[PDB]
Amino acid sequence: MGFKVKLEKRRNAINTCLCIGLDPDEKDIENFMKNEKENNYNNIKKNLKEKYINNVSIKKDILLKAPDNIIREEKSEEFFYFFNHFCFYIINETNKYALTFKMNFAFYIPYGSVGIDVLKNVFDYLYELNIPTILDMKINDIGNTVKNYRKFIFEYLKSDSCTVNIYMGTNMLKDICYDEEKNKYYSAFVLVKTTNPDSAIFQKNLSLDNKQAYVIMAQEALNMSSYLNLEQNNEFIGFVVGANSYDEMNYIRTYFPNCYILSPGIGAQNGDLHKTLTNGYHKSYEKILINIGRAITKNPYPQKAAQMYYDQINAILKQNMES
Amino acid sequence: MGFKVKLEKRRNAINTCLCIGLDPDEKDIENFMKNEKENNYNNIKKNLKEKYINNVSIKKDILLKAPDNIIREEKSEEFFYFFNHFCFYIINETNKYALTFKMNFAFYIPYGSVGIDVLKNVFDYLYELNIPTILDMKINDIGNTVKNYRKFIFEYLKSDSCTVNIYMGTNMLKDICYDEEKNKYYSAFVLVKTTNPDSAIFQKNLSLDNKQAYVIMAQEALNMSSYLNLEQNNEFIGFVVGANSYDEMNYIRTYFPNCYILSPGIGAQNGDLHKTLTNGYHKSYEKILINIGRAITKNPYPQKAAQMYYDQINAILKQNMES
Numbered sequence: 001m002g003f004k005v006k007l008e009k010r011r012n013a014i015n016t017c018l019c020i021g022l023d024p025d026e027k028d029i030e031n032f033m034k035n036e037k038e039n040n041y042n043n044i045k046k047n048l049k050e051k052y053i054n055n056v057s058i059k060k061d062i063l064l065k066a067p068d069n070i071i072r073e074e075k076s077e078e079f080f081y082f083f084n085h086f087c088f089y090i091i092n093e094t095n096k097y098a099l100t101f102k103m104n105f106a107f108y109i110p111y112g113s114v115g116i117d118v119l120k121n122v123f124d125y126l127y128e129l130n131i132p133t134i135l136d137m138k139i140n141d142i143g144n145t146v147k148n149y150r151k152f153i154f155e156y157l158k159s160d161s162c163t164v165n166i167y168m169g170t171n172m173l174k175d176i177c178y179d180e181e182k183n184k185y186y187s188a189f190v191l192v193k194t195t196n197p198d199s200a201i202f203q204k205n206l207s208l209d210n211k212q213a214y215v216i217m218a219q220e221a222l223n224m225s226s227y228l229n230l231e232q233n234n235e236f237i238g239f240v241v242g243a244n245s246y247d248e249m250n251y252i253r254t255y256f257p258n259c260y261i262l263s264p265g266i267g268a269q270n271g272d273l274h275k276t277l278t279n280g281y282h283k284s285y286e287k288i289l290i291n292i293g294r295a296i297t298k299n300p301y302p303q304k305a306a307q308m309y310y311d312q313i314n315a316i317l318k319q320n321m322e323s
Numbered sequence: 324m325g326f327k328v329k330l331e332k333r334r335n336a337i338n339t340c341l342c343i344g345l346d347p348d349e350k351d352i353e354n355f356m357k358n359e360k361e362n363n364y365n366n367i368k369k370n371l372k373e374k375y376i377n378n379v380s381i382k383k384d385i386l387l388k389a390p391d392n393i394i395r396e397e398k399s400e401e402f403f404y405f406f407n408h409f410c411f412y413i414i415n416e417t418n419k420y421a422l423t424f425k426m427n428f429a430f431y432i433p434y435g436s437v438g439i440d441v442l443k444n445v446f447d448y449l450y451e452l453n454i455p456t457i458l459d460m461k462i463n464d465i466g467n468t469v470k471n472y473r474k475f476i477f478e479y480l481k482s483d484s485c486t487v488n489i490y491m492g493t494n495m496l497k498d499i500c501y502d503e504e505k506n507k508y509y510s511a512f513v514l515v516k517t518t519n520p521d522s523a524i525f526q527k528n529l530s531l532d533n534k535q536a537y538v539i540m541a542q543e544a545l546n547m548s549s550y551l552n553l554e555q556n557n558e559f560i561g562f563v564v565g566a567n568s569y570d571e572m573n574y575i576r577t578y579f580p581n582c583y584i585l586s587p588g589i590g591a592q593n594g595d596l597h598k599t600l601t602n603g604y605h606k607s608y609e610k611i612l613i614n615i616g617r618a619i620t621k622n623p624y625p626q627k628a629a630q631m632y633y634d635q636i637n638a639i640l641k642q643n644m645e646s
Contacts, residue, residue, distance in 0.1 A: 023468075058436075106464055110474040112443055113381075113436030120435055138463050140488050140514075141429055145346075151433040165463050167490035168516055191463075193491055206539060209530065216529060 002234020003160045003187040006132050007286040010099060017277070017285040018313050019134070019262065020098040020306065021293025022122070023107045024086055028298065029079070032086040041067040047088045052128040056121040063121075079111070084118045088125065093303040094296060095131055097310035100160075102262075102291055105137035123157040133159045134262065138191060140165035143175040150176050154186045161187040163240055163262070170220040177237060178228045185233035189262045190221050192252070194245030214248065215255070222256060236260050241280065243271050243290075249279040258282070264291040268299075273309075274316045281320045325557020326483045326510040329455050330609040333422060340600070340608040341636050342457070342585065343421040343629065344616025345445070346430045347409055351621065352402070355409040364390040370411045375451040379444040386444075402434070407441045411448065416626040417619060418454055420633035423483075425585075425614055428460035446480040456482045457585065461514060463488035466498040473499050477509045484510040486563055486585070493543040500560060501551045508556035512585045513544050515575070517568030537571065538578070545579060559583050564603065566594050566613075572602040581605070587614040591622075596632075597639045604643045 011017075036044055044067045047053060053063060062070075062077045063084055070081050091101070103122060108115035126133050139149045139162060153159045164176060177186050192214050195203075203210050218239065225237040236259075241249050243265025252259065261280050265271055273290070280288040292309050299305035334340075359367055367390045370376060376386060385393075385400045386407055393404050414424070426445060431438035449456050462472045462485060476482045487499060500509050515537050518526075526533050541562065548560040559582075564572050566588025575582065584603050588594055596613070603611040615632050622628035 104464070104468060106468050106471040109439070110471045110479060112479055113439040116432070116436040116439055138488075140461050140463065141427070145427060145429050148429040148433045156433060156435055165461075165488050165490060167488060168514060191491060207532065207535060208539070212530060213536075216531070 002185065002230075002236075003132065004231075004234040004236060006160060007099070008284070010132060011284075011286045014096065014099065015317075016097060016099050016310055016313055017289050017317070018097055018306075018310050019100045019102050019289040019291040020090075020094055020296055021102050021104070021136075021264070021291050022087060022090055022297065023104045023293045024083065024090075024297065025107060026110075029083050029086055032089070033078075033082040036067065036082070036085075043089045044085050047085055047092060050088075050092060052125055053088065055128045056124040058117040058121050058124075080114050080117065083115065084121055087118065087122045090297055090302055091122075091125060091129075094306040095129065097303075097306045098131060099286060100132040100134055100289060101126055102134040102136050102293075105135060120157065123159060127158050133157075133161070134189070135159040135162045138163050138165045139176065140168060141172065143172055146172050146175045150179065150186070154179075154184075161189065163191065164188045165191050166217070166221065167191075170217070170224050173221065173224045173237065174228065177224070177230055177235065185228065185230050185235040187230065187235045187237065187260075189238045189240045189260070190217075191240045192218060192248065194242050194248040197247055211248075211251075215251075218252065218256060222259065238262065238287075240264065243276045246275055246279050249276065253280050253282065253288075258284075258287065260287050260289075262289045262291065264293075266290060266292055266295070268295040273312055274319070277313065277316045278320060283321075285317060325508065325553075325559075326455065327554075327557040327559060329483060330422070331607070333455060334607075334609045337419065337422065338640075339420060339422050339633055339636055340612050340640070341420055341629075341633050342423045342425050342612040342614040343413075343417055343619055344425050344427070344459075344587070344614050345410060345413055345620065346427045346616045347406065347413075347620065348430060349433075352406050352409055355412070356401075356405040359390065359405070359408075366412045367408050370408055370415060373411075373415060375448055376411065378451045379447040381440040381444050381447075403437050403440065406438065407444055410441065410445045413620055413625055414445075414448060414452075417629040418452065420626075420629045421454060422609060423455040423457055423612060424449055425457040425459050425616075428458060443480065446482060450481050456480075456484070457512070458482040458485045461486050461488045462499065463491060464495065466495055469495050469498045473502065473509070477502075477507075484512065486514065487511045488514050489540070489544065490514075493540070493547050496544065496547045496560065497551065500547070500553055500558065508551065508553050508558040510553065510558045510560065510583075512561045512563045512583070513540075514563045515541060515571065517565050517571040520570055534571075534574075538574075541575065541579060545582065561585065561610075563587065566599045569598055569602050572599065576603050576605065576611075581607075581610065583610050583612075585612045585614065587616075589613060589615055589618070591618040596635055597642070600636065600639045601643060606644075608640060 108119040135153050153162050177188055195210055221237050230236055238260030240262050243263045282288055296302050296305045431442040458476050476485050500511055518533055544560050553559055561583030563585050566586045605611055619625050619628045
């Protein structure tokens with residue numbers, strides 16, 4: 001029942017490795033409110049039709065209220081309402097093409113508690129729909145402090161996985177991916193520092209070898225995975241590998257053959273999708289999640305945007321399968 | 324008016340470099356509620372006497388209500404009330420001995436929005452008292468994403484500084500310590516990976532040199548400080564250097580003579596205070612902040628605990644001054 005089965009199960013259903021980034025900025029939210037006011041709130045109306053909205057934890061009866069009724073009667077919940085309703089809109093619109101959804105914590109906290117009420121309900125809504133989640137939060141602190149994040153992420157939000165920054169040492173992973181008291185196991189993706197690689201000569205001259213360094217770190221993280229018995233519990237520790245780091249991606253997929261990789265970077269005005277996916281390719285292609293965010297969420301037609309990226313990944317997977 | 328003047332000003336007033344860590348766990352909060360119920364709520368009563376409590380942003384009139392009246396009438400705000408009131412209690416009790424207060428974000432988020440309403444008000448209360456703040460949150464992400472944290476930390480909380488994890492690259496610092504639009508400058512402490520140092524031989528054998536590596540990173544961060552004009556704006560970028568890393572601390576203070584250092588690690592059952600402070604010593608001793616948390620906040624007499632640590636730092640500063 002780990003994340004590993006969650007991923008394989010849904011892989012067999014929708015046959016993609018597309019990861020949809022839900023990173024709603026202040027502009028997006030304002031822009032949604034504006035368009036919905038100007039369009040007789042048709043997307044919020046679409047959202048209210050859906051049954052799961054009745055299953056979220058926080059101010060359910062505010063979200064359930066009519067949008068006209070919100071501005072007149074609840075001018076104090078207007079931001080909450082439109083924030084929370086924009087994430088629903090992206091979710092309802094694009095979920096059929098999503099292997100997973102990844103939420104960056106950063107976008108949810110700069111307004112105070114209120115973005116955190118919405119993050120909860122976003123994770124509530126996605127758990128009700130049984131779509132695999134990643135919380136991108138890049139957690140990092142000492143073992144006893146990091147237990148707080150484990151609770152927030154895996155117990156409050158009930159996320160399947162998160163991202164982690166283990167620069168300071170791998171041993172924090174023991175207190176994120178494992179809960180001794182409750183005998184529970186969780187999955188994480190660790191950040192790997194990847195090169196330019198035109199900057200490689202400067203590192204040699206500095207006597208640094210960034211390549212030895214990230215492989216050493218990589219191994220320590222898989223060493224932790226095995227020590228924590230995560231695989232036998234259907235969980236894993238994988239890598240966050242930048243989309244344009246073609247060298248590291250290839251090297252990693254090669255020297256750690258069955259590791260899980262999450263690859264951010266591709267957008268509308270940059271990124272070679274085939275190149276990234278091919279370098280990180282695995283027959284079990286849930287092991288190479290391709291994150292697209294803004295190219296979908298800021299496109300005036302998110303579902304079509306999502307459909308296009310799904311279609312592009314389809315064709316690359318087909319090419320790679322025929323190897 | 325930067326943090327640098329803030330620090331120097333208060334240094335001249337209370338003459339310490341003691342940093343008090345306010346990291347309230349679930350146990351602490353429960354324990355406070357229990358003791359206050361059993362003691363006729365004398366500390367909450369003490370807290371309500373104080374004038375600044377009238378200046379916080381979130382559910383002021385819940386915090387202002389009588390503690391008997393909370394359990395009877397507001398059983399849903401009971402956790403908020405006792406959480407928020409325990410931080411006030413530690414603050415009122417120990418602030419005279421504190422150069423700065425450092426709050427770890429981790430302790431405030433695992434219950435959802437509610438800990439974040441309290442973090443706000445904790446930062447509100449400390450801004451009203453004009454005590455220098457650090458938010459320990461170890462932020463790390465790409466430049467455009469990290470702008471969200473800048474907003475949360477420096478604009479919503481109005482913190483003087485934060486901690487940052489720059490493993491993935493120094494250039495994120497441009498979007499945390501500097502706001503081009505508003506021409507504003509902020510201070511940060513970056514994490515430095517320090518050795519055992521019995522583990523040094525293993526790194527040599529791995530061809531790693533962790534010492535070259537953190538000094539290189541260190542320089543890149545001060546390079547960013549100068550590029551961002553933070554000094555001329557009374558801000559800085561300093562280092563988080565573990566208390567027991569006597570080697571790195573000495574090396575850093577030596578080779579980067581006037582950098583700002585924040586040193587966590589010392590507690591009741593470990594740490595040599597004199598050794599850490601002496602290794603990192605600067606005549607302008609706000610440049611070597613010594614963080615004590617649990618040894619104060621979990622001690623049944625926090626102010627006495629705080630007074631003792633203040634007194635111990637006093638004596639070490641005296642010894643170092645007479646060099």
